[PDB]
Amino acid sequence: RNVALITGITGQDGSYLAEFLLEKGYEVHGIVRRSSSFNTGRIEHLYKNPQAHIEGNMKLHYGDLTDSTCLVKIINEVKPTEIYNLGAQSHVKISFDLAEYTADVDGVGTLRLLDAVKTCGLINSVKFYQASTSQLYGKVQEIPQKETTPFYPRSPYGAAKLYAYWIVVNFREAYNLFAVNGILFNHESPRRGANFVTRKISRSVAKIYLGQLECFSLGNLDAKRDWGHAKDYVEAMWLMLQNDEPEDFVIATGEVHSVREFVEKSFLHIGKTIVWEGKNENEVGRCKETGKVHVTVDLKYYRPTEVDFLQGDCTKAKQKLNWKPRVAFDELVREMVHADVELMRTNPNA
Amino acid sequence: RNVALITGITGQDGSYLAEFLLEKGYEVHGIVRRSSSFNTGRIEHLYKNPQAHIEGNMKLHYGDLTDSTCLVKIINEVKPTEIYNLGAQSHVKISFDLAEYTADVDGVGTLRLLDAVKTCGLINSVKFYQASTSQLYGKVQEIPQKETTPFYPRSPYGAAKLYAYWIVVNFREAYNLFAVNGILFNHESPRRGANFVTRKISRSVAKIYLGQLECFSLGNLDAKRDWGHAKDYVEAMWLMLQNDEPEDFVIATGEVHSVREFVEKSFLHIGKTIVWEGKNENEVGRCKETGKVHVTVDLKYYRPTEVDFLQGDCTKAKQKLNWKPRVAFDELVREMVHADVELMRTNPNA
Amino acid sequence: RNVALITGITGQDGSYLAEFLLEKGYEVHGIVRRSSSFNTGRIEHLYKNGNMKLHYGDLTDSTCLVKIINEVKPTEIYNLGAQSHVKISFDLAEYTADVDGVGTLRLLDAVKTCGLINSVKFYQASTSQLYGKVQEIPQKETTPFYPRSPYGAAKLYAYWIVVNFREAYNLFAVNGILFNHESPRRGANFVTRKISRSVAKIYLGQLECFSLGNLDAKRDWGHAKDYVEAMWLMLQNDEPEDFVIATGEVHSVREFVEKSFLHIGKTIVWEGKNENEVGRCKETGKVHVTVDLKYYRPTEVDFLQGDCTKAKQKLNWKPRVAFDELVREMVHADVELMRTNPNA
Amino acid sequence: RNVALITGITGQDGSYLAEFLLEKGYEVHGIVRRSSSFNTGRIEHLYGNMKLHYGDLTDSTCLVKIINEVKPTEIYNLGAQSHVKISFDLAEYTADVDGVGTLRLLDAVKTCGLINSVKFYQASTSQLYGKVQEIPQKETTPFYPRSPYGAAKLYAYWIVVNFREAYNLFAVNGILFNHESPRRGANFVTRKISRSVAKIYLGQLECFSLGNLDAKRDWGHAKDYVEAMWLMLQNDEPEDFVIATGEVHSVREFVEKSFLHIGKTIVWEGKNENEVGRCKETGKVHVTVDLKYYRPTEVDFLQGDCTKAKQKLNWKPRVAFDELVREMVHADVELMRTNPNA
């Protein structure tokens, strides 16, 4: 009997994780927010009959990480063996203007879910996965970063996720809950939110190729990231819960690239060579072959306290879990641009 | 200077109101929830460039009715002349299992918005519209229901909206805020949420017509409602803020029909005549011409405390605003079925 | 098995209710807020040094309410906990909504979560503030509600969420629609205790003058010791019904001031009008009462007078203490207190 | 212009800080919770240049109204659910007040347009060291919290750092170690011991129960530590500092030294929850152990290194452990003899 409860099931990771666990024969339950319109686009294919919306081995429940009673009711009805806490306000720029909501969902909501496990009498039966993050390293104190690199958060998102990391450790130590922190670095896919930098670039490049757009604006072009594929990373979350002891792990590729490089490589897939001119907020990217400007900079996309550089060392996970990433940067860029060209050609309003 | 701020801009009513105010020359601002997917499908045609998603006279801001600082920041930046508080968890059945979240958004959230107006120094310069509701009458104490009919709520949604009604009256009386309660009766459209009874029926009948669904289940077939068209009702909201004095008004058709009638008329639009057999949870609806059962009853769609009957008396609004409804019940049903058949032919999952 | 859980046990009513249920042999549990100082002065005398147990909690913390209810398994719950001051509710509107409105829902949801919906009896502390603007005099159960403060609006939410749990789930839950009740343990910020304490300081030479707000407001004032018995009676009833509890007599604040001063040998004579009105002692010539606009409310509740016929008929309840006797008892107690400790 | 706003003015530290600032000629404003009873006992003697305002660290509108009306030059955020044992049963409330409440106050400063004119003090804590990663602990020792209180205070520490770095707010974390006084809350171990010992001396009590006798702490005096808070805001640059005595003693030693001041020598017998403390001179048992006073995850050992504060602020403690014990026992004897129910 394998019964999983996923908070954040409608998100990028929750959609891939649901597919992965269904293939292994799990009964999969998800918590979905009430919405005035459709919000299940990433998972609508996982109904027994998607046309008629008839559920099979995936069951959805209305709820929210800010409603204490709804979490107790769902956990008591489902009695899960595994809980994956993926639900969050996950956008770092948005966290600067929505700091209080971000604290309530990403920080206090982690405690609410842990308290619901305890209220339901499941502290000694459930295994709990927390969605921790390389944003905890912020202004990095070591390069590369690994499990024993000290934390230095740099946004209201990072501060909220730091609370969540430590409240999970305290339940593990105080009550012997099997609970783990996955310290995941950036991971993307064709299902990535449109407001994250990689998907923003692939969508915009697609629209330019098709004549639906002339130019778009970015923020800090010199930021450097470790980018993997979400489909690979959800496997690591499951492996952490199969481990004999509840241990925390970094999950990453170890390879670093700039935003500028993501832009350059994306445009090469549509036959265009970007050459940069200007400085600071006045920098632009121009196509060599046509002379047209396609990329500009706008300070509205900068963050007040930036995270300049991330590079993860996942040696501990490779040794203990036998996890390895499959998709590297060049393949990720290609896949994202190709998927967005097909999407935008089929539907220009997408 | 005509500058509107709409909470709940992504919802049914917010989408039609945004269009109406833009046609009258307003600068229109909306508060939008952060979502992991797009949630702006009802208003994406109101960008200056819809393929490129570039804003014109409509401007969107991230926020939530539970985040105090965001509301003050938006109101202080925008300095609106009119505020329409349409944001809510609006589903009555869902409110029984999300009672606490519904109280915080629909009840306390109204107070947060009023307090933001006061904090920003705008108590003498803004006009405020509250989205009140015929659910306040609940177990109806008069037939028909008018502004002076006593309230008798019958759900956590109704109780939260009752708090909101009275906190608005108290700001009007204490501080001379121009604030009004629109006591609107049920209003529908092709943009109505899928989980409301009218849109559930029109979508299900469309799928049956396309041979993609055999049967669907409803709850209480004998519930009676006053149903109008959302496009007509957003005009009344605007008229209530054009009034010289702040007054509360009932907005309704005055005509009553059952859920069962909505079902029968919907099926006639696809060439089928429904004849009913049996009682209570064992009642079924069978097509006379083919012999096939297309409608069953499931107790899971019933509410613990039902609102059996609503019929609005809009005499005061006809006399003081010169408002009248344009769309009647028969036309509403025809429009919703025709729209959903056309939609279902392109996408069987709608 | 008689096991009561009282939210608001440290307050005026909770202290008298605790005594009442203890005298009848109940096991009494209370929810107490964490404080940086001592906050249990009204109930310290009820320790074994026994049958009263205290638990740390808050009406805004969901998990604590479930933990307490699951451990205690009460047969009766009295939700007396609240930010209960009407003037303060205008400056603390959001906190007042969260505690007095949503907190009632949290407690009802805790009962449901703990599986006690069919076993517990639930008393809600409802209020005559729900009759904020009135055309019917006296007011009874069928008089319409019209709140006039953020306190009143929060209490109206609480009244109706209680009704919805009764109707939806067949919970035995009742609204006590209680009119003003006072005592020597009444909070000092309420008008009656403000007057008695100030009159007593003036008597002992500790104070010369004090200021009030609206002198012409009219109220139905009873004694808290009488009203807590009515709460228990409502839970012993065969069916869950809502009741008005009141004296039926109405007096002004001006009247309360005049009578209080008569108990210290002084005859109050008023001069001027509105915010510049003062009360002077006739036999000495000294000004002892002024008016300050800062003590007015933006939206006043002008007049309250309750008809408790339903309660007299179904519960056999009647009030024992009247306005004149209450004034005498409060002024007498504060005179003792200020003589025995001028810092009390 | 010198105008202070103190959250937590009714608590131990707020009462000493109010006195200190008033003696320097500050206008002092405080935020007080509505209570059904009197809650201003520590500051009632200061009734002028002190003004009190009703509020709560969970009510956003009240914080903006107060900050906009007062326009303080200095804010001290001392308000908190501050009891570590209670935090295990009130984890959600503790997060909302101690964690989120710090963000609400910072956001109010920003909303009111005061980022460049206010200096902000945050009440951080040696509980951040939890399971100590070094001995003694200094500003660079890694944090490892061990309760819902400690986790909430960790969020508060880092949201303060983020406002400093993002917006150039003059904001600082005082990383203060345990500090006590005759006004210390009765539920903390030092005041529990001094009150119980005073009652035993006067024949008003026979015996009391404690939890973990072998926990070790660095204990100073609150009057000295509020001075350090003010010095951190007079500094030219906004820096974080450890404030401590550098001396460590056990709960067991606090018990023994307290009883010596009333003429009794405690000798211990038995083990774990069956351990008792007996007076050698009389043979009478006065101390027992009850597991109900233990914490699920204990903080075993705290000892602070305040070299940075000595070098940059010229701060030093005036009172050490032995004088603190003497002062607390003598004050509680005088209190209990003057009023048996105090």
Ligand SMILES: NC(=O)c1ccc[n+]([C@@H]2O[C@H](COP(=O)([O-])OP(=O)(O)OC[C@H]3O[C@@H](n4cnc5c(N)ncnc54)[C@H](OP(=O)(O)O)[C@@H]3O)[C@@H](O)[C@H]2O)c1
């Ligand atoms: N590179 C990465 O992607 C990365 C790396 C490390 C950690 N993380 C963290 O890993 C998790 C999954 O990332 P993702 O990319 O899949 O994020 P995502 O696409 O933004 O998905 C977030 C999910 O959380 C849900 N959610 C938001 N607020 C909620 C609330 N109040 N109550 C309940 N559910 C709520 C969202 O629902 P709606 O669809 O209704 O908005 C959505 O299902 C997040 O916690 C994220 O912070 C991500």
Ligand SMILES: NC(=O)c1ccc[n+]([C@@H]2O[C@H](COP(=O)([O-])OP(=O)(O)OC[C@H]3O[C@@H](n4cnc5c(N)ncnc54)[C@H](OP(=O)(O)O)[C@@H]3O)[C@@H](O)[C@H]2O)c1
């Ligand atoms: N018959 C009727 O339609 C009727 C009659 C009387 C009164 N009402 C009331 O009138 C209003 C409009 O009705 P409708 O049919 O347009 O409702 P709807 O389609 O359900 O729209 C609700 C809107 O509120 C937003 N919202 C929900 N929770 C929010 C939060 N926490 N913060 C900010 N925004 C939030 C939703 O955003 P998402 O898109 O992100 O979910 C959406 O924009 C509602 O208040 C409803 O209760 C409706």
Ligand SMILES: NC(=O)c1ccc[n+]([C@@H]2O[C@H](COP(=O)([O-])OP(=O)(O)OC[C@H]3O[C@@H](n4cnc5c(N)ncnc54)[C@H](OP(=O)(O)O)[C@@H]3O)[C@@H](O)[C@H]2O)c1
């Ligand atoms: N005339 C009347 O007295 C009258 C008439 C009708 C209705 N009522 C209502 O009846 C009830 C009792 O009145 P009263 O005069 O006894 O009021 P009170 O003296 O002001 O007592 C209020 C009680 O509620 C507690 N409380 C406040 N906030 C709380 C929170 N967030 N969580 C948990 N407990 C909290 C208080 O604790 P602290 O001691 O820590 O502050 C205190 O125990 C109240 O609900 C009041 O609104 C009173």
Ligand SMILES: NC(=O)c1ccc[n+]([C@@H]2O[C@H](COP(=O)([O-])OP(=O)(O)OC[C@H]3O[C@@H](n4cnc5c(N)ncnc54)[C@H](OP(=O)(O)O)[C@@H]3O)[C@@H](O)[C@H]2O)c1
């Ligand atoms: N050894 C130490 O003493 C030490 C060491 C490091 C850090 N700290 C921290 O330093 C600060 C002061 O310590 P202390 O010993 O003076 O604490 P305390 O005696 O417990 O005082 C706490 C203060 O905060 C107030 N408060 C509690 N909840 C509140 C809320 N929701 N809204 C507004 N105010 C609220 C309390 O009011 P009431 O009086 O109404 O309860 C009281 O005034 C605290 O933040 C504490 O955690 C203490």
Ligand SMILES: Nc1nc2c(ncn2[C@@H]2O[C@H](COP(=O)(O)OP(=O)(O)O[C@H]3O[C@H](CO)[C@@H](O)[C@H](O)[C@@H]3O)[C@@H](O)[C@H]2O)c(=O)[nH]1
């Ligand atoms: N979104 C965005 N980022 C931009 C832009 N221009 C430059 N950037 C820079 O590109 C980098 C990546 O930004 P995001 O794609 O938004 O991701 P993130 O901030 O690293 O956060 C993501 O990864 C975290 C793990 O490190 C996750 O915790 C988080 O939830 C999120 O998925 C940042 O340094 C950002 O400033 C732009 O127009 N948009």
Ligand SMILES: Nc1nc2c(ncn2[C@@H]2O[C@H](COP(=O)(O)OP(=O)(O)O[C@H]3O[C@H](CO)[C@@H](O)[C@H](O)[C@@H]3O)[C@@H](O)[C@H]2O)c(=O)[nH]1
């Ligand atoms: N949703 C739904 N309702 C059903 C079903 N079967 C029967 N009904 C009945 O159909 C009636 C209408 O339900 P809804 O369409 O969900 O609307 P509502 O509960 O009346 O609430 C709507 O109108 C209110 C004004 O009266 C609004 O306040 C509210 O937000 C919402 O828009 C109710 O009596 C309901 O029990 C079913 O399967 N689904």
Ligand SMILES: Nc1nc2c(ncn2[C@@H]2O[C@H](COP(=O)(O)OP(=O)(O)O[C@H]3O[C@H](CO)[C@@H](O)[C@H](O)[C@@H]3O)[C@@H](O)[C@H]2O)c(=O)[nH]1
């Ligand atoms: N407190 C106060 N009230 C004053 C003053 N001067 C005049 N009043 C007037 O005296 C009347 C009584 O005020 P309170 O004693 O504060 O009581 P209340 O507002 O009637 O509220 C109490 O009774 C309600 C039931 O009617 C309760 O619901 C509520 O919790 C509270 O106990 C009000 O009309 C108030 O304006 C003054 O200086 N202080």
Ligand SMILES: Nc1nc2c(ncn2[C@@H]2O[C@H](COP(=O)(O)OP(=O)(O)O[C@H]3O[C@H](CO)[C@@H](O)[C@H](O)[C@@H]3O)[C@@H](O)[C@H]2O)c(=O)[nH]1
């Ligand atoms: N309170 C208490 N503590 C006891 C008892 N018996 C033993 N102790 C032990 O005595 C030690 C001190 O406990 P407290 O006096 O409660 O203080 P604290 O947990 O160290 O917390 C105080 O200091 C922190 C700084 O380190 C502050 O952050 C916190 O707010 C509080 O003031 C702890 O190890 C505790 O387990 C008892 O009966 N009561």
